[PDB]
Ligand binder design. Sequence first.
Ligand SMILES: CCCCCCCCCCCCO[C@@H]1O[C@H](CO)[C@@H](O[C@H]2O[C@H](CO)[C@@H](O)[C@@H](O)[C@H]2O)[C@H](O)[C@H]1O
Lengths: 50, 150, 1042, 50, 50
Amino acid sequence: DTAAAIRAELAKMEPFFPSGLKIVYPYDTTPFVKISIHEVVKTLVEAIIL
Amino acid sequence: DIAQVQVQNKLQLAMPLLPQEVQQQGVSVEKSSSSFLMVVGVINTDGTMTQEDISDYVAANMKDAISRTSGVGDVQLFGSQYAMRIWMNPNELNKFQLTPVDVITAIKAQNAQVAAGQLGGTPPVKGQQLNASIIAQTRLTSTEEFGKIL
Amino acid sequence: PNFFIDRPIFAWVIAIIIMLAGGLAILKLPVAQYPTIAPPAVTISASYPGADAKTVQDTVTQVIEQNMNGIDNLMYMSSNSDSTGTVQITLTFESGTDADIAQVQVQNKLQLAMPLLPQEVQQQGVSVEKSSSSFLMVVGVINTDGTMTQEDISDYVAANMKDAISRTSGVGDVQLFGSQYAMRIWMNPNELNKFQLTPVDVITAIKAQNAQVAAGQLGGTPPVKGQQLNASIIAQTRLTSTEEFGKILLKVNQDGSRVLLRDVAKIELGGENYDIIAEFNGQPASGLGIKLATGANALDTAAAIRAELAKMEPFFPSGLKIVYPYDTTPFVKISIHEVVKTLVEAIILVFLVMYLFLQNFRATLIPTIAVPVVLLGTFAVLAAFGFSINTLTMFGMVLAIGLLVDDAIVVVENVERVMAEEGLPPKEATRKSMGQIQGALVGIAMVLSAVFVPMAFFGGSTGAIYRQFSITIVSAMALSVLVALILTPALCATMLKPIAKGDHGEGKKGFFGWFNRMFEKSTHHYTDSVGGILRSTGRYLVLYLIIVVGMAYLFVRLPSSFLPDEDQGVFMTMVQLPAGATQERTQKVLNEVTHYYLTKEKNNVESVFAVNGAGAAGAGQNTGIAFVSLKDWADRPGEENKVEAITMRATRAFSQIKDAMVFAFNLPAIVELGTATGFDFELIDQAGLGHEKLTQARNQLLAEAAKHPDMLTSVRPNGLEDTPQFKIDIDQEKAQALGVSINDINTTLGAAWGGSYVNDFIDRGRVKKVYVMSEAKYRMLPDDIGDWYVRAADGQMVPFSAFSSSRWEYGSPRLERYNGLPSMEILGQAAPGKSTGEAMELMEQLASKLPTGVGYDWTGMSYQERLSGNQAPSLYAISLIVVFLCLAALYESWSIPFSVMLVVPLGVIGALLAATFRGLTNDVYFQVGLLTTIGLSAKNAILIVEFAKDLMDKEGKGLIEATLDAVRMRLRPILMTSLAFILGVMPLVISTGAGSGAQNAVGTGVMGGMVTATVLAIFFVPVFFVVVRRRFSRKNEDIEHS
Amino acid sequence: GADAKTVQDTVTQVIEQNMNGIDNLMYMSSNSDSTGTVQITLTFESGTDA
Amino acid sequence: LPTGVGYDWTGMSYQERLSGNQAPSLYAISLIVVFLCLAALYESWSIPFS
Ligand SMILES: CCCCCCCCCCCCO[C@@H]1O[C@H](CO)[C@@H](O[C@H]2O[C@H](CO)[C@@H](O)[C@@H](O)[C@H]2O)[C@H](O)[C@H]1O
């Protein structure tokens, strides 16, 4: 949630950035929690199929 | 929240016993994680700017708002904000028989905001008919005026 | 359930228990006008004496905006930087945040920013406060003999009254309106110059001869052996008289003469600040703003306060009387009076219908006993969930009466019917019938809470308002069904008199009952007709479809509101003069208005409170406000004696026949909220741009919305436009040359024109301030600059005309910020037929038209709502799904739930009809009303279809016959209730006097809905059941006899 | 160094004046010292959140 | 004592003043709780009086 809010703020700042200003994302504990818990959900449903 | 309250309430009792340099450079009390949740990157692709230009765009356009994001404990700057940098020459200073202290005092004097007053100020005189703001000594703005500092 | 029919004492005991806890809750329960509705806001306020807008924006404001981070649950941060030297930072938080925690976090981050502040600001005190704008009452304090000036009075407040009122029980906050006494030293520049002295020396003097000093002690520790005395050293003491301040030395002259302060400057006890000058019916006054304690009872806080003032009455100085310019309390006294009045009347009407319909006295005593119990209990259930007796919760009960009343009636009736039909003894009739309506009763509770709880989960201020009604009503309802299953059956089975089989009393009596045949005949007429319509149904299906499309049309073409505006015994008129105007001019206007209300409204206006210096627009000499109090409502009978009409003739009065802008208006009801069809735009300077560029973008947008009057309407900025300001360019070179310290130039200039808080002194036992400033006559006009001289290094005086060049420029008097950044506020509302949303979309489109570095944003009201409207469809989809699921349980049908759900429009067409022909608007009271109405139609249809199904299944009767019999036996109760309801509500629909806006809002929609819904349902429901029932199954069939 | 009567109507009663609308306050008592310390105790309704 | 000299209890004596002023109320309710209860379990309306 904290992270989703921050992505909202950065997005609200995007159009007023100087010429050439891109944001990069070198490190975030977020994508692992997301894809990991999603694989566990994949598994429950798969398991119901079996 | 409460722990933070009890802690900062002891910190303010310690504050007067602190240095003025320490005091005004700012002390912070935070309920934070010891690990970064995330690291946000800022670059320029078309490389029309050095790291400082960037460091300042970050510190001057983004970092205040990100640290006001609800739920964000600490934000660390990989870089720094812009500052008025006065880099003294020991030789060219000694030549004129002046010391760093005089640089300090000078800047303190020719650069400031000043409580002025008001034309038609309150409490006025009978029938009086003009009210306006006195604009006095204002902070310096550009770099060059720091050269015209006498 | 059946259980109590054989245990009437146990029932009585639970009843008593509910009554006692409820009565206990009634005794120790809070009262307020409204609950907490607005999101939490905490403001940091600070003042920088003499400084200008840009100064306070650039010495404090930005320093604080930068130091306020990592504070929990922040929504938005908005601030004013005033050229009156005050800076205010609003931090508005997410709704439901711990108010107190937020305020604590804000004030501790500020306590960290404090060392980075100016020394003057730091020492004047920065304050952190919670921001409800809702004072319980505003007490005026005056003098009759023109004995004392307003500074005198203000001080009298601060030194004699303010403390005891804050000792009054139930008073959680006392705010002071005015300024305290100060030691005011008004320098004379001429007699200052005569003696070659500058304000600087005045400063240094006053700081020096007036001070407390760390002394010490005789017999101090560790003393010497045998030592014999311990006592206190009393040293240099602060001054006490004004006179002692006259005797302070500024210089010794060579010829032995001394130069005292008394000489260069007039010295007197006078106001800490003179911006705001207040007059009460012309006579001078000061004021006290009392806020209700947290969770406290309003009526007793007010009563206690008036009593406290009376206990102080004989101790007031000559001519000092206390007045009450603003008081929420009688609005609440009278509204409470009206709600209970309605409840008892309603009870009376249910007795009157119950007699003039069942005419058996002990029958009529049953529902009479029922509801009191239920009310009481709901008060306890509410108390348990931490509410108070306030407007919203009470009109929630007023709405609940319908459901309570119906439930009681349903039971008593059905029992009576079972007797007059079958010849059962009272009790056996009771088990037959409780056992007849039971499932319908639990189901109706499930469906009623199924529509009423989803609206509890609305978010934001809108969500709070809904939450009140939702809980009050569901609790009243759930208790009414428990009571309908435990006590009512007990009361039925026990105290009810037995009826002869096939009685109907179809005559027997001469005086009172010549009606029973008339009703009997007609109830058969009715069912005759119903079968008749069940013959050809199609035509009637058409009628329905028509009714619905029409209902939609009525729904769309009806106006949305938030709440009905209320004459509250009080209104106000605001006054705005041309930029840079004078205290004395604004004051002149305000005296004129004051008189207008005291003239052309000799009979309506009780008292007028003119405040010069503080307004709507902001602070400054340039603005005024008028607080206008109105006579008690009994003395204002007519249509012309009401606030709408008054504010009309006053705005009409001060528009055409004035030289400056004067609006007159009435406050909203929940006094901190928004203008239903309006919005609050924030135009934000996003790039490293300029104030000049931002304002130009603002003009640009004002123009582009000027081009769209079919969508947006009267779109306007909410700030102060630029004023001409006086620039003093100091030549650093010349001043350093002629031998003058720039500091001496600055601080003499300051202490001359802006003033300086120097030291503190102790009057009568209370520490106050010491201000040194020019005299009036030497600091008004720009030329006066010349009268002030700066002493040089050597010992010589220097005119400002020697090193200071001067001019005029433009500048801004009010510098606004949004989220740390430079911003500009833009208020507005939508076109007459157009929706606030459309107007907002167009506004985003226009603001998108702006130059680069210009972003846009929403704040306040527009924030809370842009979140909240996303939810009505979702919550109501939840509701349909849940209710259908419930009815799907109750029968054992996935389809029969449609024969009752199909009934919902029947009631709406009455509400929408009734609002439009009455000229009302689609607001809360109307919406809660619509739901309430849906609630009765759903109840009745659920009972009808239950009965129908029951004869079909557990009696093997046919279809058309079964529904026939059904609607037959359940005609009478329907009609009984609806008679009761329409009669109790009717007062709400036809009422003026206090609070009648809300009362009409409830009453109308409801009444219209009741009428069309029952007088439609008795015909449309049977077709619903029948037509639906005929989409199942394989023959099977249509039917009968097994 | 200040005296009792000094610290009491400069510090004690000044601070005692804002102690209204405090939830669950039972009683408030305060001391004023010429040894230089000034102290105000707030005793609260039993079961109040400390 | 002379007019304007009032009196009070605090701390131990306060709390004691409390238990004293609460004893009758306690006996009213607790007696009444039981009357209500026996009238319930024992369907008799009379068993409570005796
Ligand atoms: C609570 C107060 C109620 C106030 C209502 C005021 C009056 C208006 C509503 C009454 C509507 C009923 O009007 C009803 O029409 C149907 C058929 O369409 C009639 O039925 C009649 O026509 C159909 C065919 O055309 C046949 O079945 C025929 O045998 C005959 O009964 C009913 O005999 C009549 O009673």
